Amino acid sequence: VLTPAELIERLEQAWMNEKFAPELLESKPEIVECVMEQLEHMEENLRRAKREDLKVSIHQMEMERIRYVLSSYLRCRLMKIEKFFPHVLEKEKTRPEGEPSSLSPEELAFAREFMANTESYLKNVALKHMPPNLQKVDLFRAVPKPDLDSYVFLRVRERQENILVEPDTDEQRDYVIDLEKGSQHLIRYKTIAPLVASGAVQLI
Amino acid sequence: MDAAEVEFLAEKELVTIIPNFSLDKIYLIGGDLGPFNPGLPVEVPLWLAINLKQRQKCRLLPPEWMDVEKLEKMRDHERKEETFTPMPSPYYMELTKLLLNHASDNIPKADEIRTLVKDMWDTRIAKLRVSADSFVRQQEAHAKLDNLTLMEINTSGTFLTQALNHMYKLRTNLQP
Amino acid sequence: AYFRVESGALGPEENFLSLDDILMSHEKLPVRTETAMPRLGAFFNAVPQGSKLELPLWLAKGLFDNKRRILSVELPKIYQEGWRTVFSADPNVVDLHKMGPHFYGFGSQLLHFDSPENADISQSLLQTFIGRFRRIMDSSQNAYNEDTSALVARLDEMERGLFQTGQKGLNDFQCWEKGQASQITASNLVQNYKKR
Amino acid sequence: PNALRFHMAAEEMEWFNNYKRSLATYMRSLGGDEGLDITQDMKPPKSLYIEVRCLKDYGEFEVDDGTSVLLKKNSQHFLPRWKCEQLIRQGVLEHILS
Amino acid sequence: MFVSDFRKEFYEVVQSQRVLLFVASDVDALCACKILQALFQCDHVQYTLVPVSGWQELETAFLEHKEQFHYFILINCGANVDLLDILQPDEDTIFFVCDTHRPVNVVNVYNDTQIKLLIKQDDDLEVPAYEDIFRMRRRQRREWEARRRDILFDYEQYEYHGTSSAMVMFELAWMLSKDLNDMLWWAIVGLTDQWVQDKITQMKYVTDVGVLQRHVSRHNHRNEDEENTLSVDCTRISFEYDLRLVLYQHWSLHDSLCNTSYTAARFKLWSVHGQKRLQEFLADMGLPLKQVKQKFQAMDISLKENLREMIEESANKFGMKDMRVQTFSIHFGFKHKFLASDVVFATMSLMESPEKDGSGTDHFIQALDSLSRSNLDKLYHGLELAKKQLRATQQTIASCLCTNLVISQGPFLYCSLMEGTPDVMLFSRPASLSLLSKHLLKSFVCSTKNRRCKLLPLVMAAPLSMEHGTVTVVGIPPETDSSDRKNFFGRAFEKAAESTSSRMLHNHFDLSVIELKAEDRSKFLDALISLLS
């Protein structure tokens, strides 16, 4: 079991990773549930305290900071879900059992509702009035996919060796580098995405 | 990320204050904050320090590195070298701004400190500009930027990354 | 919280829902007709074989096939050797706004027609971008609270996006340093709705 | 606002209502009770209380269930930030920094 | 009743509640509100601040808020009237009153539960005893009633002002150990506002200047190395023995000399020989004309070294002995330096601005914002407006004195502004009219020959509304170097209107400013004459 301070540390780490990643990252139900529970317990405890105290104000300020971080993180995830909904749903549909999910159940319900609402609107406003063979729009092709070739700044948390930098399509130009702990690099996201997933690097 | 959020991150750094009130140990989710006793020093996060100062409850103490001699040596070293040198704090610019804007009455020689921090900032920004120009002109695929702070990266990061994305797409046009 | 669908013109295919891409593909492109085209003579009744026409890029892309059955495509003068040599001399003085607002996006999509000059078009587009980067970066990050009409006059659509990003970064830091970044303000849309 | 409603088509209004319902459901599902309304807390917090000035007449505004305050133009109130954020974002209140 | 302990009876009582602030429209009230706001925001006190400009506005606001609040603080209003009768509150409501107006109404003085006066008991207050004013029949009861009538009439004859409310608030802040330098500056500005408007005597001003000098020394006195290491961005307040000239550091010395009522009145600059006298004064100084006509900041530094002493000496030669006044200045940054009277004039000009695009509650908000160092641009804008207002005042004074518009009735002087006057619009608002009337009386007393007319008070009228035919009427007491600054025109006006049955409105918090139906005017005046002669 994590200490509460470590829990807030992981919350901030996920916040920044989601803020800079070009795609929807992996869901973290434990972090969200634990943080919400911590906020609820702190609110209850403060309800037992007197209003005039300095301690109550300090506790409230800390809770405000935690709440802001959680809200911003969830907003970022929701924006990504709305931007790429067909592809998010497709990835979730065909996921292997062992592999971790990128959607919480509630996010999944939200995404399904978003897709159905948008499709029904498009059908009812224009597509039903088009010629019979033009009535189907494949939303999978109409909505752009995440661009995984984006450049990101990262800080190394755990040393990594033999990372393959590919400057272009030509193989002969590709070379290899080392990532040392504490070092900071600017590199394409596609090369280092598994390291973001495992926690070896932090996106800044 | 915007500058307000980098400042939010910077506000988690620990500083020392002398309170004029008494309070028992506080069990914050982030971590315990020791008992507060009038006239005695105690370590707290920067956000709480600024709040207590604004409410006339504490007096702030400058960090150890906020010293004119040390800062002058650091500025000279930064000007002499070619890469980025390690900074006294990962949020030196934000800490300087907040502390000197809110507690200059508590920090002697605040004007000199501000000027030295400004000198360091200007030198490092110029080094980052040279790095970006070299990245684009020489057509690099990767770069190393050690000892560079979050605020420095955030000042021009979006522009550089967007330019690099466009340049990569232009470099990979001919691949079918 | 409003983010239009972004351009995909520099990639292998353009984005279906991108307004910029639709406007870019509206632009014309010289073609030569390789087959008689009945019942469309009114719009250009048959169009004779070998006729020379200007078609929108989307229409040319639709009719084009690698074996050149319906039509063959010719490059606009802007992407031919004569202008490529002018670009190499000094790419900073050419007005890419007048020579096609979507200069890079249009040139990128021309590579779909498998011209013998594909390698030269590609190399020219890259060098032009590299040769213009420093000026774009400097002007965007150092023109503060000033008139920029002369600084963006010659930039194309893709470059104007970078310039706006650079100005945004400069403005945000200036606001933070002056202490204006902490006030809670009316949303951007509310300001443009109720005060414009 | 009705001004904005005027531009939308009826089908667009139906889409907006459906989206609003879905967002409310998701926000309700996050926490034990009432969940978390992630439409608030749009900027990092600085102070627990703030000073607000009324930019227009708005009438009664509930501070706590027991007590309300009348919003009339050019009056000033010292209030918790989380109760004023929404009205500030709508252009009803202005945040005064001194 | 009076409050003895401001910490225990007022601030600790209010700290835990929600409070409503009614703030009047004068600079001293604004400074008091600033100090109180700083204190409340330190302690997370939920407060509502409502600007009010007159009795009708206050009554309307109270009606709007009486249900939602139980604690009200009135700043510079409510002490001279029977508040419980005007407001008709509930028995549980409590009114804290921090008001400079005197005398205090007897009903307010002797209320145990609802009226609490934040007034120092050391002030000039001679309240009648409870028995004589609150309680064989012909022998005693009628005698007691007649005596009460006499004592009440004597007690409520003259209107004056007590200690500044900003100073009371600063004393409260010092008691709480929450007093900062900004609070001290606000207190100084409040006292200077009292001085600039002739609300207090010279002796009281000097006494309060000494009181504030002690606080300034406590807050700003440090040794040489401490001064060396202290950042230039920290505010510094200094006691100064400076000049009476108005805004002279933000204007040219020539313009300041021409537009300061003191020098302008003594040189008779509205006359043709006054300009020659001013030229003689400048020649006696040795200041080149081109230098004195240049902006003070751009003037050559060599002339500034001993400017105050040389000006004092030359003025002494020319019959002005009061060129130098004890005041304060505030410095911050490299650039920003202000004298207290400059801030007072800028705030007044922001509040009484003639730009009618913005309402008066809008003009109040601008004035209140200007007092914060974050809104420095507003302060500079107010300085420009003050320059314009001073020029307009001098032009109006010249027009009044040259045309012999100040005519002496028997007991008082009468001057009336007409709609044909160019700048009349700038003086329709009551505060501007009052200040103009005081400046005009000073100029007239300096420039008249008749000895009797020098010892008379002044009554001044100006048009208010051309729709309703209303005129604003102000009355001010005689202008003398040792004047007690006490005014009897409020009761005289109320007694004239009652005897003549005119249509008068009392809306200003001062009883010497009234609104009258123009047609009644003539009639009114005769009664007033008969009443004062």
Phi-psi region of B31 (alpha: psi -120 to 50; beta: other; left: phi over 0): left
Method by which the model was determined: cryo-EM
The number of C-beta contacts closer than 8 angstroms across A and D is: 64
User: If you ran DSSP here, which 8-state letter would residue E139 be given?
Assistant: I
Nearest CB to D44; choose among B5, B51, B54? B5
Nearest-by-CA chain B residue for D46: B47
Both B25 and B94 in one domain: the answer is no
Partner-chain contact A55 B140, CB within 8 Å:
no
User: If you ran DSSP here, which 8-state letter would residue A21 be given?
Assistant: -
Both B83 and B60 in one domain: the answer is no
Partner-chain contact E16 A52, CB within 8 Å:
yes
Both B127 and B87 in one domain: the answer is yes
Provide the residue count of chain B: 176
Cβ of residue A58 closer than 8 Å to a chain B Cβ? yes
Q: How many Å apart are CA A86 and CA A82, to the nearest integer?
A: 9
Cβ of residue A57 closer than 8 Å to a chain E Cβ? yes
Dihedral sign, Cα of residue E444, residue E450, residue E454, residue E455: negative
Q: Which letter, b or e, does each residue of E327-353 get, where b requires 16 or more Cβ atoms within 10 Å of its Cβ?
A: bbbbebeeeeebbbbbbbbbbbbbbbb
User: What tokens does A155 get?
Assistant: 């800080």
Q: Is A154 helix (H, G, I), strand (E, B) or coil?
A: strand
Owner of token pair 């013998």: C116
Chain E 48-67, CB below 8 Å of chain D: which residues?
Answer: 48-51, 64-65
User: If you ran DSSP here, which 8-state letter would residue E507 be given?
Assistant: -
Rg (CA), chain D: 16
DSSP for C11-52 reads SSS--TT-HHHHHHHTSEEEEEE-S-EET-GGG--EEPTT-E
Both B29 and B91 in one domain: the answer is no
Residue type, E361: T
Query: Which residue from D86, D89, D83, D81 is spatially nearest to D97, judged by alpha carbons?
Result: D81
Q: How many Å apart are CA E349 and CA E371, to the nearest integer?
A: 13
* Residue B105 CB-density burial (10 A; 0-12 exposed, 13-18 middle, 19+ buried): middle
Which residues, 6 or more positions from B89, have their beta carbon under 8 angstroms from its beta carbon? B13, B63, B65, B95
User: If you ran DSSP here, which 8-state letter would residue A175 be given?
Assistant: E
Partner-chain contact E234 B111, CB within 8 Å:
no
Partner-chain contact B104 E233, CB within 8 Å:
yes
Both B71 and B135 in one domain: the answer is yes
Both B33 and B81 in one domain: the answer is no
Alpha-carbon dihedral B112, B117, B120, B125, rounded to 10 degrees:
-140
Dihedral sign, Cα of residue B88, residue B94, residue B100, residue B102: negative
Report the topology of domain A145-204. Answer: Ribosomal Protein L9; domain 1 (3.40.5)
Sort out which chain A residues have CB atoms less than 8 A from C5's CB and list them: 144
User: If you ran DSSP here, which 8-state letter would residue E476 be given?
Assistant: E
Q: How many Å apart are CA B167 and CA A6, to the nearest integer?
A: 40
Query: Which contacts qualify for A27-36: CB closer than 8 Å, 24 or more apart?
Result: A27/A100, A27/A101, A27/A102, A27/A103, A27/A104, A27/A107, A29/A104, A31/A7, A32/A70, A32/A74, A32/A104, A32/D30, A34/A2, A34/A7, A35/A7, A35/A8, A35/A11, A35/A66, A35/A70, A36/A70, A36/D30, A36/D31, A36/D32, A36/D36
Q: How many Å apart are CA E215 and CA E217, to the nearest integer?
A: 5
User: What tokens does E516 get?
Assistant: 């009258």
Architecture of the domain delimited by A2-144: Up-down Bundle (1.20)
User: What tokens does E290 get?
Assistant: 């081109």
User: What tokens does C85 get?
Assistant: 């040599």
Partner-chain contact C3 A83, CB within 8 Å:
yes
| CB atoms inside a 10 Å sphere around CB C113 | 19
Both B92 and B176 in one domain: the answer is yes
User: What tokens does E297 get?
Assistant: 């900041």
Dihedral sign, Cα of residue C54, residue C57, residue C59, residue C63: positive
User: If you ran DSSP here, which 8-state letter would residue E142 be given?
Assistant: I
Distances (CA, A) of C158 to A90, B129, C153, E172: 31, 21, 13, 63
Partner-chain contact D79 E46, CB within 8 Å:
yes
Phi first, then psi: what are they for E392, rounded to 5°?
Answer: -60, -40
Phi first, then psi: what are they for E4, rounded to 5°?
Answer: -85, -55
Alpha-carbon dihedral B118, B124, B129, B133, rounded to 10 degrees:
160
Dihedral sign, Cα of residue A180, residue A183, residue A188, residue A190: positive
Q: Which letter, b or e, does each residue of E17-28 get, where b requires 16 or more Cβ atoms within 10 Å of its Cβ?
A: ebbbbbbbbbbb
User: If you ran DSSP here, which 8-state letter would residue A138 be given?
Assistant: -
* Residue D50 CB-density burial (10 A; 0-12 exposed, 13-18 middle, 19+ buried): buried
User: If you ran DSSP here, which 8-state letter would residue E137 be given?
Assistant: I
User: What tokens does A138 get?
Assistant: 């494949």
User: What tokens does E383 get?
Assistant: 């300085």
Distances (CA, A) of B86 to B78, B142, C22, E471: 9, 21, 49, 75
DSSP for E410-443 reads SSSEEEE--TTSGGGGGG-SHHHHHHHHHHHHHH
Measured between its terminal Cα atoms, the distance across chain A in Å is: 27
| Cis peptide preceding A194, ω within 30 of 0 | no
End-of-domain residue from the set B66, B87, B109: B66
Dihedral sign, Cα of residue C164, residue C165, residue C168, residue C170: negative
Q: How many Å apart are CA C91 and CA D95, to the nearest integer?
A: 48
Q: Angle formed by the axes of helices B150-171 and C118-142, to 10°?
A: 160
Q: How many Å apart are CA E397 and CA E461, to the nearest integer?
A: 14
Provide the total of helices (H) and of strands (E) in chain E, helices listed first. Answer: 22, 16
**Resolution in angstrom units:** 2.6
Sort out which chain A residues have CB atoms less than 8 A from B51's CB and list them: 61
Which residues, 6 or more positions from C18, have their beta carbon under 8 angstroms from its beta carbon? A144, C4, C5, C6, C7, C8, C9
Please check whether residue E33 is in contact with residue E3, taking contact to mean a CB–CB distance below 8 angstroms.
Answer: no
Nearest-by-CA chain E residue for B104: E231
Q: Is A150 helix (H, G, I), strand (E, B) or coil?
A: coil
Both B83 and B98 in one domain: the answer is yes
User: What tokens does B129 get?
Assistant: 């500009």
Cβ of residue A52 closer than 8 Å to a chain E Cβ? yes
DSSP for E159-209 reads BEE-S-HHHHHHHHHHHTT---HHHHHHHHHHHHHHHHTT-S-HHHHHHHH
User: What tokens does B38 get?
Assistant: 């009038």
| CB atoms inside a 10 Å sphere around CB B10 | 22
- The greatest distance separating any two alpha carbons of chain E, rounded to the nearest whole angstrom, comes to 84
Measured between its terminal Cα atoms, the distance across chain C in Å is: 19
Please check whether residue E209 is in contact with residue E50, taking contact to mean a CB–CB distance below 8 angstroms.
Answer: no
Q: How many Å apart are CA B174 and CA C112, to the nearest integer?
A: 10
Query: Which residue from C31, C48, C47 is spatially nearest to C39, judged by alpha carbons?
Result: C47
Q: Angle formed by the axes of helices E307-317 and E273-285, to 10°?
A: 130
Please check whether residue A153 is in contact with residue A186, taking contact to mean a CB–CB distance below 8 angstroms.
Answer: yes
Owner of token pair 């939602």: E68
Dihedral sign, Cα of residue E109, residue E115, residue E121, residue E125: negative
Domain holding B89, by residue range, is 67-176
| CB atoms inside a 10 Å sphere around CB C179 | 12
Residue C54, CB-side half-sphere exposure with 13 Å CA sphere = 5
* Residue E462 CB-density burial (10 A; 0-12 exposed, 13-18 middle, 19+ buried): buried
Q: Is A145 helix (H, G, I), strand (E, B) or coil?
A: coil
Q: How many Å apart are CA C76 and CA C59, to the nearest integer?
A: 16
Q: Is E119 helix (H, G, I), strand (E, B) or coil?
A: coil
Which residues, 6 or more positions from B8, have their beta carbon under 8 angstroms from its beta carbon? A65, A68, D44
Q: How many Å apart are CA E261 and CA E273, to the nearest integer?
A: 17
Both B91 and B116 in one domain: the answer is yes
Query: Which residue from D72, D56, D67 is spatially nearest to E67, judged by alpha carbons?
Result: D67
User: What tokens does D63 get?
Assistant: 């501070």
Please check whether residue E343 is in contact with residue E379, taking contact to mean a CB–CB distance below 8 angstroms.
Answer: yes
Please check whether residue E388 is in contact with residue E425, taking contact to mean a CB–CB distance below 8 angstroms.
Answer: no
What is the bridge-based pairing of β-strands C46-47 and C37-38? antiparallel
From the CA of A74, how many Å to the nearest CA of chain D?
7
Kind and range of the H or E element at E380? helix E376-402
Q: How many Å apart are CA E434 and CA E510, to the nearest integer?
A: 11
Cβ of residue D78 closer than 8 Å to a chain E Cβ? yes
* Residue C6 CB-density burial (10 A; 0-12 exposed, 13-18 middle, 19+ buried): middle
Which residues, 6 or more positions from A60, have their beta carbon under 8 angstroms from its beta carbon? A46, D48
Three-class DSSP labels, chain B: CCHHHHHHHHCCCEEEEEECCCECCEECCCCEECCECCCCCEEEEHHHHHHHHHCCCEEEECCCCCCHHHHHHHHHHHHHCCCCCCCCCCCHHHHHHHHHHHHHHHCCCHHHHHHHHHHHHHHHHHHHHHHHHHHHHHCCCCEECCCCCHHHHHHHHHHHHHHHHHHHHHHCCCCC
Both B135 and B163 in one domain: the answer is yes
User: If you ran DSSP here, which 8-state letter would residue E452 be given?
Assistant: G
Q: How many Å apart are CA D2 and CA D25, to the nearest integer?
A: 25
Alpha-carbon dihedral E98, E101, E107, E111, rounded to 10 degrees:
20
Please check whether residue E162 is in contact with residue E102, taking contact to mean a CB–CB distance below 8 angstroms.
Answer: yes
Sort out which chain D residues have CB atoms less than 8 A from E364's CB and list them: 74
Query: Which residue from A188, A192, A141, A193 is spatially nearest to A167, judged by alpha carbons?
Result: A188
Report the topology of domain C1-179. Answer: Methane Monooxygenase Hydroxylase; Chain G, domain 1 (1.20.58)
Q: How many Å apart are CA E348 and CA D2, to the nearest integer?
A: 42
Residue type, E299: M
Nearest CB to C16; choose among A79, A83, A142? A142
Sort out which chain A residues have CB atoms less than 8 A from C18's CB and list them: 144
Owner of token pair 């009339």: D72
Chains in contact with A, counting 3 or more C-beta pairs less than 8 Å apart as contact: B, C, D, E
DSSP for A46-84 reads HHTS-TT-HHHHHHHHHHHHHHHHHHHHHHHHHHHHHHT
Sort out which chain C residues have CB atoms less than 8 A from B7's CB and list them: 176, 181
Q: How many Å apart are CA E36 and CA E166, to the nearest integer?
A: 9
Q: How many Å apart are CA A64 and CA D85, to the nearest integer?
A: 13
Query: Which residue from A139, A122, A113 is spatially nearest to D23, judged by alpha carbons?
Result: A113
From the CA of A57, how many Å to the nearest CA of chain E?
10
User: CATH number for the domain including B54?
Assistant: 3.40.5.50
User: What tokens does C32 get?
Assistant: 């030569």
Angle, CA E247 vertex, CA E243 and CA E250 arms, to 5° = 120
Partner-chain contact D36 A67, CB within 8 Å:
yes
Query: Residues spanned by CATH 3.40.5.60 within chain A?
Result: 145-204
Both B72 and B159 in one domain: the answer is yes
Q: How many Å apart are CA B29 and CA A37, to the nearest integer?
A: 12
Q: How many Å apart are CA A189 and CA A150, to the nearest integer?
A: 6
Q: How many Å apart are CA E406 and CA E10, to the nearest integer?
A: 48
* Residue B71 CB-density burial (10 A; 0-12 exposed, 13-18 middle, 19+ buried): buried
Query: Which residue from C91, C87, C79, C83 is spatially nearest to C116, judged by alpha carbons?
Result: C79
Please check whether residue E188 is in contact with residue E212, taking contact to mean a CB–CB distance below 8 angstroms.
Answer: yes
Both B80 and B56 in one domain: the answer is no
Chains in contact with E, counting 3 or more C-beta pairs less than 8 Å apart as contact: A, B, D
Please check whether residue C173 is in contact with residue C195, taking contact to mean a CB–CB distance below 8 angstroms.
Answer: no
Q: How many Å apart are CA C100 and CA C20, to the nearest integer?
A: 13
Please check whether residue B18 is in contact with residue C190, taking contact to mean a CB–CB distance below 8 angstroms.
Answer: no
Query: Which residue from B29, B3, B2, B34 is spatially nearest to B16, judged by alpha carbons?
Result: B34
- Where do the DSSP E strands lie in E280-411? 324-332, 336-339, 407-408
User: What tokens does E505 get?
Assistant: 């409105």
Q: Which letter, b or e, does each residue of C50-61 get, where b requires 16 or more Cβ atoms within 10 Å of its Cβ?
A: ebebebebbbbb
Alpha-carbon dihedral B117, B119, B123, B128, rounded to 10 degrees:
40
Number of folded domains in chain B? 2
User: If you ran DSSP here, which 8-state letter would residue E4 be given?
Assistant: S
Dihedral sign, Cα of residue E436, residue E438, residue E442, residue E448: positive
Nearest CB to A55; choose among B23, B30, B175? B23
Distance of CA E493 to the CA centre of its chain: 21
Residue type, C65: D
Q: Is E325 helix (H, G, I), strand (E, B) or coil?
A: strand
Cβ of residue E43 closer than 8 Å to a chain D Cβ? no
Query: Which residue from E44, D60, D49 is spatially nearest to C184, judged by alpha carbons?
Result: D49
Q: How many Å apart are CA E441 and CA E447, to the nearest integer?
A: 10
Please check whether residue D55 is in contact with residue D73, taking contact to mean a CB–CB distance below 8 angstroms.
Answer: yes
Kind and range of the H or E element at E363? helix E360-370
Nearest CB to C162; choose among B129, B132, B159? B159
